[PDB]
Design a protein around this ligand. Structure first.
Ligand SMILES: [Mg+2]
Length: 308
């Protein structure tokens, strides 16, 4: 039984659940999951958890995401994307300097709301305006972070660029907001998630067109997951008691990696096996002080044990 993370590529068309169903179908395993959905009209990286590997999906959903988008100026649909019913089409005639100025104006954080806008009375603009101001109660705004925007390319009414954003941010919403800044609305016509954390689309695999062996042989084992995050290794001998309960104490450790208090670290054994994930009860620099003193207290508190 393999345990790990699978870097899948979702083609434009199918839903994220469809991808999980395909993987589930070919692997014939016991557990398959996903983290951080991708709209049907978009394509790109979709993290897939397999068996015990699903237990660490939350960490992947926290990673940053990088998208490459293409929006049409002067077009407004119901869903804010081409697959949406055209509800309005204004006229745009702004300069490339006005566009760029608007685009790069969103770098930072701004509280956005889900894509609404209807063609009905008291539901088009005005509603969008109020929601945005945090005045509508059924549409609470969310605080998002637009880390950086680059590779902007203005070709007529259509413009494209790349953005590194925090999870939970709607790319469709970002376009529309930019579209209103210019004063003529905008709609997403193309969307590709190029990366999630260090996992890239070039690295991804199309499970739909992949043979079972391919998919299986392509999972990243737990030992290789969560590459970032400090790693501490405990003497082999402590493998069993850790796999059961048992917190980790000073004398049980063999190799640090440097960590702060509340930080989370990966617990390996001498054989290279990932035993668990734990939270640091102490600093790290303070360990030398716990030693030098016959004091051997708890140093790491068990968070997730991988009883594989
Ligand atoms: Mg689901």
């Amino acid at each position: 039984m393999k345990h790990g993370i699978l870097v899948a590529y979702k083609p434009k068309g199918p839903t994220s659940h469809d991808v999980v169903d395909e993987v589930r179908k070919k692997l014939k395993t016991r557990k398959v999951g996903h983290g951080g959905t991708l709209d049907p009209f978009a394509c790109g990286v979709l993290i897939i958890g397999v068996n015990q590997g699903t237990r660490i999906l939350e960490f992947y959903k926290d990673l940053k995401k990088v998208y490459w988008v293409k929006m049409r100026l002067g077009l407004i649909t119901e869903t804010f994307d081409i697959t949406g019913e055209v509800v309005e089409e204004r006229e745009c005639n702004v300069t490339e300097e006005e566009i760029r100025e608007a685009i790069f104006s969103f770098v930072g954080e701004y509280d956005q709301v889900p894509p609404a806008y209807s063609a009905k009375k008291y539901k088009g603009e005005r509603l969008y305006k109020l929601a945005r101001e945090g005045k509508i109660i059924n549409l609470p705004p969310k605080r998002v972070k637009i880390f950086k925007i680059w590779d902007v390319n203005i070709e007529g009414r259509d413009v494209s660029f790349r953005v590194e954003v925090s999870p939970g941010t709607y790319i469709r919403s970002l376009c529309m907001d930019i579209g209103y800044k210019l004063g003529c609305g905008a709609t997403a016509v193309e969307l590709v998630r190029e990366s999630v954390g260090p996992h890239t689309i070039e690295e991804s695999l199309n499970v739909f067109e992949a043979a079972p062996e391919e998919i299986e042989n392509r999972i990243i084992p737990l030992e290789k997951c969560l590459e970032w995050l400090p790693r501490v290794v405990v003497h082999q001998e402590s493998t069993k008691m850790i796999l059961n309960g048992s917190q980790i104490h000073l004398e049980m450790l063999k190799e640090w990696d440097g960590f702060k208090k509340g930080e989370v670290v990966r617990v390996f054994n001498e054989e290279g096996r990932l035993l668990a994930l734990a939270e640091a009860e102490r600093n790290s620099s303070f360990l030398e002080t716990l030693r030098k003193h016959e004091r051997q207290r708890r140093v790491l508190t068990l968070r997730k044990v991988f009883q594989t």
